[PDB]
Amino acid sequence: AGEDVGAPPDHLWVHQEGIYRDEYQRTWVAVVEEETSFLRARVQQIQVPLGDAARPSHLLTSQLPLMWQLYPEERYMDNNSRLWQIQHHLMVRGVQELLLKLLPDD
Amino acid sequence: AGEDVGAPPDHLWVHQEGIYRDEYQRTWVAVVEEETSFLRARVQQIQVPLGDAARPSHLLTSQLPLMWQLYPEERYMDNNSRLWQIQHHLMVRGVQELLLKLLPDD
Numbered sequence A, B: 001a002g003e004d005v006g007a008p009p010d011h012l013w014v015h016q017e018g019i020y021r022d023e024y025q026r027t028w029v030a031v032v033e034e035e036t037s038f039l040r041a042r043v044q045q046i047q048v049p050l051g052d053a054a055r056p057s058h059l060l061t062s063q064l065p066l067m068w069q070l071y072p073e074e075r076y077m078d079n080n081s082r083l084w085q086i087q088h089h090l091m092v093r094g095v096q097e098l099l100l101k102l103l104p105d106d
Helices: none
Strands: A011-016 A019-021 A027-034 A039-044 A067-071 A075-078 A083-092 A095-102 B011-016 B019-021 B027-034 B039-044 B067-071 B075-078 B083-092 B095-102
Touching: A039 A083, A083 B083, B039 B083
Parallel strands: none
Antiparallel strands: A011 A019, A011 A067, A019 A027, A027 A039, A039 A095, A067 A075, A075 A083, A083 A095, B011 B019, B011 B067, B019 B027, B027 B039, B039 B095, B067 B075, B075 B083, B083 B095
């Protein structure tokens, strides 16, 4: 809104805890910013090294999902069917940033 | 969007450089976050002390305006008739926050 950032990624697949990859093989770093009543994830498109993909056993306990898939009405649906609202998608200090908010399951 | 923050202030009047007051006499602290191609102001509703109102002569050089007035389509019009897009209005760490983006004059 008032930006020239373009379209958000169609999908984000986890590689290692907190590091995702989109349909273009670009890496995104996700950090948790937990509020009292809810959880937000700030995801930035930053080129980071990739080592081994983590085992799902380690990822089961994470606060972030295994995957996000672009869903109608500017939000993402994860692997557990939960919806994440895109609160903002902008360029910050030259880096593309998504601000996601985990919504209550309806 | 996905928030329960409510309505943004109808107006913000500068008191001292970077410190504004809304229609309820509540103080808001504004900081500049300048990008390469544009300028953003992050404004948070935080209770701060108020001393003397600054003289307009000192405020003429500031990057922030003397006042913001809520304008249709979620944006603010300042004292110079410029428009600022509200990119986000949310509660961050318990503090209400506005993220404004100065748009090119049209």
